[PDB]
């Protein structure tokens, strides 16, 4: 393959030599006759001297050693100096590679080339499966779905990982190899283009492996957030937020907790009047929710006493009711009550018409972000806008958090320990730099995993519960991966410094990396290909045919 190219250049140098050497005049003196000694071209040389010619150009590393020379002793006899079998002898110490002929036994060699084909397919089968899944998700009528957009970026990380290994293998097959005895000798040397490419590939690969667990952390946070209840607390928490010390607002009041007010004139020790009362003793999520839990019931009470707002509240489902309560929380009974045509539409179950009517007002102008999430809640009737708010965070805890660790690790590697393709066994920076964030991710994925089971018992015991419900269906995918991947990558690294290479360690190596190669299809299958919703949309697109 790669040796065949070198063989043609070597041969060419050989013909170029024989042709060069023919045109020179015969020698008057007794010299070592000119020869191509299989390595370089050598002129007639006087006896008792060491001739020289620059390092032959056919060598893959010619440019690095073009300034260097090979030498050859012409012996007292008039004959060149030979080696033990009478072969040509020279000193090409200078021209020698910056690498090693690593000899690999016939049966160990055939074995690694067999077990290489296993991992090359596993990743390619995970590649086609991931890129099909992306073609299924992104090309189609889930075009703007928030739940899929997390899956899509997970799949892209596993596409990155998989893509990086194929590049690396493809570059390590460049390596020059030949049959020396029964052993196969493989050269460590790689060309500068081949060095750079596989280095970048290794960074991408290390960035992918941190991104995988950062995007499986997002997949777990998703269910934890998505499945909390969800409540009006979290809604008004995302719309406004929690606080404990007071601060001034648009009107200049003691605003505290979640959109609550303590006093009526601008004062601090007079704001204490209501703060001592509602606790009733001598500021927390255990304490100061008591302020928010009065304000909701007060807002709910006021809505029932308001004649324009009550039959709209009555007519609405539980989740859209929380959206109306929100609107009052912001404005009040009187303000909301004056959305007379928008209200009429929500009472009539005309959500898309209400939504366009609400956006036309000077509420959506004064707060385009909050009004947009509230209007969506009316539009659709789920907590989707508030799940979506957390997405832009999850992009930067899926992509940016790996980049915070690895890119400086890529800078570190460059300046200290600069091997051709970085899969090093040093342990100084593949523990702290690249393994710490995957450990810290798995750590948080475990604290969540248990918090999901307590969250799913509470869901399934209440009336929010059925088994064919997509929220439970999606937990069948996520709750399998965190134990599958969390075990497989900590038991690996825990026991990855125990054997020297080895025969049992290299047998361990292949049982693990073959599971890791199909890892990118497993994910593609249980999320994308096994989803009910996606299976039905294929049965709609394929049945229009």
């Amino acid at each position, epitope marked *: 393959q790669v040796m065949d190219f*070198l063989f043609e250049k070597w041969k060419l140098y050989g013909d170029q030599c024989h042709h060069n050497l023919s045109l020179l005049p015969p020698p008057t003196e007794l010299v070592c006759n000119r*020869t191509f000694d299989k390595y370089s071209c050598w002129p007639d040389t006087p006896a008792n001297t060491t001739a020289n010619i620059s390092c032959p150009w056919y060598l893959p590393w010619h440019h690095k050693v073009q300034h260097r020379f090979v030498f050859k002793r012409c012996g007292p006899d008039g004959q060149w100096v030979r080696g033990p*079998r009478g*072969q040509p002898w020279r000193d090409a110490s200078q021209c020698q590679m910056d690498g090693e002929e690593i000899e690999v036994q016939k049966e160990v060699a055939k074995m690694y080339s067999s077990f290489q084909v296993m991992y090359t397919v596993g990743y390619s089968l995970s590649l086609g499966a991931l890129l099909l899944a992306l073609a299924i998700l992104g090309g189609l009528s889930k075009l703007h779905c928030t739940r899929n957009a997390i899956h899509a970026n997970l799949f892209a990380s596993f596409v990155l990982k998989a893509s990086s290994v194929l590049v690396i293998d493809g570059l390590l097959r460049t390596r020059y190899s*030949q049959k020396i005895g029964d052993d196969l000798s493989v050269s460590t040397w790689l060309s500068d283009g081949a060095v750079a490419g596989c280095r970048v590939a290794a960074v991408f690969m290390q960035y992918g492996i941190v991104a995988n667990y950062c995007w499986l952390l997002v997949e777990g946070l998703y269910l934890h957030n998505l499945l909390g209840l969800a409540n009006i607390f979290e809604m008004l928490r995302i719309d406004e937020g929690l606080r404990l010390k007071i601060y001034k607002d648009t009107e200049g009041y003691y605003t505290i907790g979640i959109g609550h007010l303590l006093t009526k004139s601008p004062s601090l020790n007079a704001a204490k009047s209501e703060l001592d009362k509602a606790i009733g003793r001598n500021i927390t999520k255990d304490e100061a929710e008591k302020l928010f839990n009065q304000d909701v019931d007060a807002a709910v009470r006021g809505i029932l006493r308001n004649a324009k707002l009550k039959p709209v509240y009555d007519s609405l489902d539980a989740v859209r009711r929380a959206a109306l309560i929100n609107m009052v929380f912001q404005m009040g009974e009187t303000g909301v009550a004056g959305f007379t045509n928008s209200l009429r539409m929500l009472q009539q179950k005309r959500w898309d018409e209400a939504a366009v009517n609400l956006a036309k007002s000077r509420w959506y102008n004064q707060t385009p972000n909050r009004a947009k999430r509230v209007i969506t809640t009316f539009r659709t009737g789920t907590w989707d806008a508030y799940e979506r708010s957390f997405f832009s965070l999850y992009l930067g805890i899926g992509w940016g958090a790996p980049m915070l660790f690895v890119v400086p690790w890529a800078v570190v590697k460059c300046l200290f320990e600069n091997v051709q393709c970085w899969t090093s066994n040093d342990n100084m920076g593949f523990w702290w730099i690249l393994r710490f964030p995957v450990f810290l991710a798995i750590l948080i994925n475990f604290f969540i995993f248990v918090r999901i089971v307590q969250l799913l018992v509470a869901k399934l015991r209440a009336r929010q519960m059925h088994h064919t419900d997509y929220k439970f269906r999606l937990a069948k995918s996520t709750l399998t991966l965190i134990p599958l991947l969390g075990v497989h990558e900590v038991v690996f690294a825990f026991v990855t410094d125990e054997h020297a290479q080895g025969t049992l360690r290299s047998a361990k190596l292949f049982f693990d990396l073959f599971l890791s190669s199909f890892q990118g299809l497993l994910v593609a299958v249980l999320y994308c290909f096994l989803n009910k919703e996606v299976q039905s949309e294929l049965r709609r697109r394929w049945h229009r045919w």
Partner: antibody, heavy 128, light 108 residues
Framework: QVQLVESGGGVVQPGRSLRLSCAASGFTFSSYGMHWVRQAPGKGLEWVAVMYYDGSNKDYVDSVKGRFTISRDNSKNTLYLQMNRLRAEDTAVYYC?????????????????????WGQGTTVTVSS | DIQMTQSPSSLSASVGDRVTITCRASQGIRNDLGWYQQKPGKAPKRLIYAASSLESGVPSRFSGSGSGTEFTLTISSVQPEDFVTYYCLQHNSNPLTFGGGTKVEIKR
């Protein structure tokens, strides 16, 4: 089918000459080094000469240097041993063997695997 | 010149016996050694190559071991066909040199 057939042997007188021949079949003759080895009647094996494809590289045992000459016709897949100025001590059975070598282009070093396949032998007998 | 000393010249065994022809070298010939068997009247046949690497279709009784300067051929269970002559050959330097040879005679 890899085999080597010698011929040329027979009775010859001290001082006169003989060209033994060794005929390769079943393999690529050009790529293998080749060797003659003799074994005198009572005694054991004795290497006598080698020749490689080039064939700049050639060698002989001391007792036959200048007296004996090795050659090969790659077109006829034949190896030869021109024996001149024969003495009594050249009385022997003359085997021909091949050696496989390997050149490492990346290092310019050569590896040698020894005499794997041998001829049947041709008796040479030097008597007046 | 690398002198190869073959020990012993003749040895006496019975079918079954473990037999150990050794063969020493006057310099470091590395692993470049091969063991031949010569049957009476027949051209020698090579058994071990590269010191220990058994040739194709040679019984597993035969085994080679040694490196640098000490080299050992070993038949674990000498059969009737093995009572013949054996030589080491060195191919590390010209002139290629043999050991003196070892006749394995049948004890009685």
């Amino acid at each position: 089918q890899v085999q080597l057939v010698e011929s040329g042997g027979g009775v010859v007188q001290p001082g006169r000459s003989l060209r033994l021949s060794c005929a390769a079949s079943g393999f690529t003759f050009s790529s293998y080094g080749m060797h003659w080895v003799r074994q005198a009647p009572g005694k054991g094996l004795e290497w006598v000469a080698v020749m490689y494809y080039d064939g700049s590289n050639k060698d002989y045992v001391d007792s036959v240097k200048g007296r004996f000459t090795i050659s090969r016709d790659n077109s006829k897949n034949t190896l030869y041993l021109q024996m001149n100025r024969l003495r009594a001590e050249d009385t022997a059975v003359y085997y021909c063997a091949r050696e496989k070598d390997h050149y490492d282009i990346l290092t310019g070093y050569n590896y040698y695997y020894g005499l794997d396949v041998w001829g049947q032998g041709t008796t040479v007998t030097v008597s007046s | 010149d690398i002198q190869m000393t073959q020990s012993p010249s003749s040895l006496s065994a019975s079918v079954g016996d473990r037999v150990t022809i050794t063969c020493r070298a006057s310099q470091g010939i590395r692993n470049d050694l091969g063991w031949y068997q010569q049957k009476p009247g027949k051209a020698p046949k090579r058994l071990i190559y590269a010191a220990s690497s058994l040739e194709s279709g040679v019984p597993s009784r035969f085994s080679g071991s040694g490196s640098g300067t000490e080299f050992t051929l070993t038949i674990s269970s000498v059969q009737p066909e093995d009572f013949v002559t054996y030589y080491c050959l060195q191919h590390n330097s010209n002139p290629l040199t043999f050991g003196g040879g070892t006749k394995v005679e049948i004890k009685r």
